[PDB]
Design a protein around this ligand. Structure first.
Ligand SMILES: [Ca+2]
Length: 290
């Protein structure tokens, strides 16, 4: 069967990369063997008589077809860069993407065993939307997903929709999994104003940084070290669905805040009032979040 062969090809490509990579999270040296070990687990479980969950479009089989083709494409990108500033950045972005691919596979096939049909989103309104719109499916192509989301939260076609796609699609696969929609709706809660929240915080906010690691943001914030109240906020790529707010304190040290149940807009507005989050990316413009 073709899925078994494809799983073997993927495990081999991850081993080649792992050997070609011979530090701080996300690290390809860590992620490559971890993802391979998970795929070996998936292969074993797919031998079982049941365990595939509801079939058809967007089920476990479809998820793996799309996931392993994308994992191949990203692995080719890494191989083409590795030695046998630009390079550091390209390998950082790809490490973030691998951290995303690992987290998604772990969320949906923990221990190798599919749970995409049972998976539950963090935010209840978003969970209901997914199960009502998408049913038992764990993954959709972007164009279908943009249509379904639009029954509730329509986005303007063109550059805005494409920006939304770039934000939601953590694995850069062109498909949205239930795990990606969980992360997105957690980050940009609350549900009733979901895309307004995303517009105000991730398209029109100079403090937002996507696809940057902890080390890259520290390097960025150090530049602001003489402007206390400077801050940037990014989605964590190691603790998916959480924000990490990096900020310059009064004394000039770089601290971190992690939001919990409060929407980001509330955290930033309260941190503005308290005088902590004042100059986004060190810029003078701080957007009004009411
Ligand atoms: Ca994706």
């Amino acid at each position: 069967w073709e899925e078994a062969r494809a799983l073997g090809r993927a495990v081999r490509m991850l081993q080649r990369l792992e050997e070609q990579c011979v530090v701080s999270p996300p690290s390809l040296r860590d992620l490559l063997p971890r993802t391979a070990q998970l795929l070996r687990e998936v292969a074993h479980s797919r031998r079982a008589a049941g365990g595939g969950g509801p079939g058809g479009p967007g089920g476990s089989g479809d998820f793996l077809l799309i996931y392993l083709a994308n994992l191949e494409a990203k692995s080719r990108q890494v191989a083409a860069l590795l030695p046998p500033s630009r390079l550091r950045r390209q390998l950082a972005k790809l490490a973030i993407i691998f951290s995303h691919m690992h987290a998604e596979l772990h969320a949906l096939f923990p221990g190798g065993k599919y749970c995409g049909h049972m998976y539950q989103l963090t935010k209840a309104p978003a969970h209901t939307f997914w199960r009502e719109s998408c049913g038992a499916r764990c993954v959709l192509p972007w164009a279908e997903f943009e249509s379904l989301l639009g029954t509730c939260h329509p986005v303007e076609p063109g550059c805005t929709a494409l920006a939304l796609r770039t934000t939601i699609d953590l694995t850069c696969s062109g498909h949205v999994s239930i795990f990606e929609f969980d992360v997105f709706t957690r980050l940009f809660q609350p549900w009733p104003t979901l895309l307004k929240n995303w517009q105000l915080l991730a398209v029109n906010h100079p403090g937002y940084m996507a696809f940057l690691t902890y080390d890259e943001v520290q390097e960025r914030l150090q530049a602001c070290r003489d402007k206390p109240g400077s801050y940037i906020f990014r989605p964590s790529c190691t603790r998916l669905g959480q924000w990490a707010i990096g900020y310059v304190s009064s004394d000039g040290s770089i601290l971190q805040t992690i939001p919990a149940n409060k929407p980001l807009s509330q955290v930033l507005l309260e941190g503005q009032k308290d005088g902590f989050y004042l100059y986004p990316d060190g810029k003078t413009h701080n957007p009004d979040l009411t």
